[PDB]
Paper text:
Here, we identify two orally available 4-fluoro-benzothiazole-containing small molecules, TKB245 and TKB248, which specifically inhibit the enzymatic activity of main protease (Mpro) of SARS-CoV-2 and significantly more potently block the infectivity and replication of various SARS-CoV-2 strains than nirmatrelvir, molnupiravir, and ensitrelvir in cell-based assays employing various target cells. X-ray crystallographic analysis shows that both compounds bind to Mpro’s active-site cavity, forming a covalent bond with the catalytic amino acid Cys-145 with the 4-fluorine of the benzothiazole moiety pointed to solvent. Using the X-ray structures, we also examined the binding mode of TKB245 and TKB248 complexed with Mpro. Both compounds have been built on dimethyl-bicyclo[3.1.0]-proline moiety in the center, γ-lactam as the P1 moiety, and 4-fluorobenzothiazole as the P1’ moiety. Taken together, the structural data strongly suggest that the 4-fluorobenzothiazole moiety plays a crucial role in the potent activity of TKB245 and TKB248 against SARS-CoV-2 strains.
Moreover, when the 7-fluoro-4-methoxy-indole ring at P3 and carbamide at P2 of TKB198 were further replaced with trifluoroacetyl L-α-tert-butylglycine and “6,6-dimethyl-3-azabicyclohexane”, respectively, the resultant TKB245 achieved highly potent anti-SARS-CoV-2 activity with the EC50 and EC95 values of 0.03 and 0.53 µM, respectively, and its anti-Mpro-enzymatic activity was also improved with IC50 value of 0.007 µM. TKB245 was found to be active against all of such variants examined with EC50 values ranging 0.014 to 0.056 µM. The presence of 15 µM of TKB245 and nirmatrelvir shifted the equilibrium more toward a predominant abundance of dimers bound by mostly two inhibitor molecules and left no significant amounts of monomers, suggesting that these two compounds inhibited the enzymatic activity in a manner,in which the two inhibitor molecules bind to Mpro and promote and stabilize the dimerization. The only difference in chemical composition is the substitution of sulfur (TKB248) with oxygen (TKB245) at the center part. Structures of both inhibitors exhibit identical binding mode within the binding pocket. In the structures of TKB245 and TKB248, we observed covalent bond formation between Cys145 and 4-fluorobenzothioazoly ketone, resulting in a hemithioketal group, with an oxygen atom directed towards the oxyanion hole formed with amino acids of Cys145, Ser144, and Gly143. Inside the S1 subsite, the oxygen of the γ-lactam moiety forms a strong hydrogen bond with the side-chain of His-163. The S1’ subsite is fully occupied with the 4-fluorobenzothiazole ring; however, the 4-positioned fluorine atom does not form direct contact with any binding pocket residues, instead it points out of the binding pocket. In the present study, we found that TKB245 exerts more potent activity in inhibiting Mpro’s enzymatic activity than nirmatrelvir.
Residue numbers in the entry:
A (entry chain A), B (entry chain A): 0 to 302
């Protein structure tokens, strides 16, 4: 039936890795994997250091014992520290016994991941996000959420892809991979920064239309087809990402399952962009959803 | 900022309780708490028994050894079985060492909970749901999801409120509390059953409008107020639940935080119902959201 939900990965393998990192009066979250704790390097900042911190200079004045690391109620001993890009790596004398099989991945714009929102090292909530084309995410983060991570789970392996650092003025979020490199052009200082144009992830909207068809929501199917070049003219007007032949190939499984050629679905999407949804819903949404990948759709449609 | 997401509870405390229950050729999920496994009683049904099962008669032919219970790759020994309403309770010789502090609660229509969707005893995904006024939920469930549970977490205590049993023809879902009593008038047989009218949870839409204001999405605030009786005339036309003085009292914290009297917000809601959203969004939604309780809003707005 028409039941289709934004589903997050079960969070238990990540919950066991969240710790609290305190330096002076600043507390945020860290990720404890093996004998290393990862956290945003601005744990070392006071509120008169945020406008333009010199992180190398601020770190000169910090020693192992200035980093307080707490896993639940239990204190970790810090035996080494280093800065890698915008993350701090705290070497502790105890390997996390709850460390899962894991990898660090730098995800591509358009890919989705689960966020485990944490405050003071304690898990608060889990939700699904996408890396947007402008390298922001539409999260739900407050003061104290920094160091919360984004991940995907493939069988038993956790692929960590995001660490939370900041909120931009449109209310969207920016952060790093687990090597401390920002997604997008953002820097970890409190200066005027703005997200570029928020373009729609075309291949995901198409995947979600396939999901609607598989789930029996079929009203938007029309009698038309189109070409990649003509569809892509329409993509540009409505700030959709161009569709490529790689995107068409990636939609192959969904196309094969439904028997609907990708260019036929593109012609259905073209009409939805030009005419709107006339106050109808698709899988219970009144807007075109772009935060389900082709892989997410196949997963939620086939178990 | 305007970031507000359907957030689920972290699932780790529930993941450790999911097992697989097999009886003959039927496999579904069970919940392993202390030395008891809970699962839907139709684990004992074959596909020629679903139209009108006599569960008491079907259970006569079942012994402890006919219930296969697997936690991961590890077989549990069944030393007793009983039927309680629409659930089976399998006594096993091993207390689940991962059993969390927990309670069984029968939730009220309008209350929200997290679902951990499971297939073959393995967690697949987590998402937030509401018990709708017609005692259905708008889930994402396939074949094999039966026995998946709904829960809330308050600190360290897990309150189990839902076990999944069935899908109705509108694509919505029905199930039981953990004592095996259905929410609503549904029965565990494959017969013509239909959800009643799907009314909107008025107090939740109001809570979500307070969230929009707290998050700076303010365009829908107007210069008007109304009365409970006049608002409630409008509630009826649009299939909204009547608003009561208890609902007004429950919205007290959000009213106090924003300084917006509940009847002023009701007058804003009245105009949104009568005039629609004119293709605008509130917290990124093109429809009025009713699956955030006042408590959910306060939680996501205050950490
Ligand atoms: C995060 O939790 C952190 N909080 C602190 C802190 F209190 C002291 C020292 C270091 C850190 S990191 C927090 C999460 C934000 C808060 C609101 N919603 C969030 O997601 N991150 C920040 O406060 C972050 C840190 C400085 C300023 N930050 C911002 O997010 C600001 N944004 C920007 O300046 C902009 F993005 F450029 F617009 C802010 C506070 C939202 C205006 C730094 C970037 C180091
Ligand atoms: C659930 O996973 C179960 N599957 C089996 C099974 F394969 C064999 C024996 C027992 C069970 S319980 C499954 C979940 C459903 C499937 C589709 N989406 C879901 O959420 N539940 C059922 O198949 C359920 C069991 C019989 C028929 N069921 C229904 O959900 C049917 N619905 C109804 O008859 C209606 F609700 F009344 F409309 C169905 C299959 C969707 C048409 C019973 C109620 C015992």
């Amino acid at each position: 039936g028409s039941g289709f939900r934004k589903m997050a990965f079960p969070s238990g393998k990540v919950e066991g890795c969240m710790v609290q990192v305190t330096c002076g009066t600043t507390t945020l979250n860290g990720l404890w994997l093996d004998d290393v704790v990862y956290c945003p390097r601005h744990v070392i900042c006071t509120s008169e250091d945020m406008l333009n911190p010199n992180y190398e200079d601020l770190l000169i004045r910090k020693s192992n014992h200035n980093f307080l690391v707490q896993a639940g109620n239990v204190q970790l001993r810090v035996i080494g520290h280093s800065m890698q890009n915008c993350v701090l790596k705290l070497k502790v004398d105890t390997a996390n016994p709850k460390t899962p099989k894991y990898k660090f991945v730098r995800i591509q714009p358009g890919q989705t991941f689960s966020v485990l929102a944490c405050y003071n090292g304690s898990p608060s909530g889990v939700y699904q996000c996408a890396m947007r084309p402008n390298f922001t995410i539409k999260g739900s983060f407050l003061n104290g959420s920094c160091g919360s991570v984004g991940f995907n789970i493939d069988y038993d392996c956790v692929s960590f892809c995001y660490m939370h650092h900041m909120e931009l003025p449109t209310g969207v979020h920016a952060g790093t991979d687990l090597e401390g490199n920002f997604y997008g052009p953002f820097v970890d200082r409190q200066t005027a920064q703005a997200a570029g144009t928020d373009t729609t992830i075309t291949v995901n909207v198409l995947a979600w239309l396939y999901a609607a068809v598989i789930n029996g929501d079929r009203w938007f199917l029309n009698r038309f087809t189109t070409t990649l070049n003509d569809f892509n003219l329409v993509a540009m007007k409505y700030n959709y990402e161009p569709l490529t032949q790689d995107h068409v190939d990636i939609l192959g499984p969904l196309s094969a399952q439904t028997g609907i050629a990708v260019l036929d679905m593109c012609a259905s999407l073209k009409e939805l962009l030009q005419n709107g949804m006339n106050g109808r819903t698709i899988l219970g949404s009144a807007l075109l959803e772009d935060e389900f990948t082709p892989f997410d759709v196949v997963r939620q449609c086939s178990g």
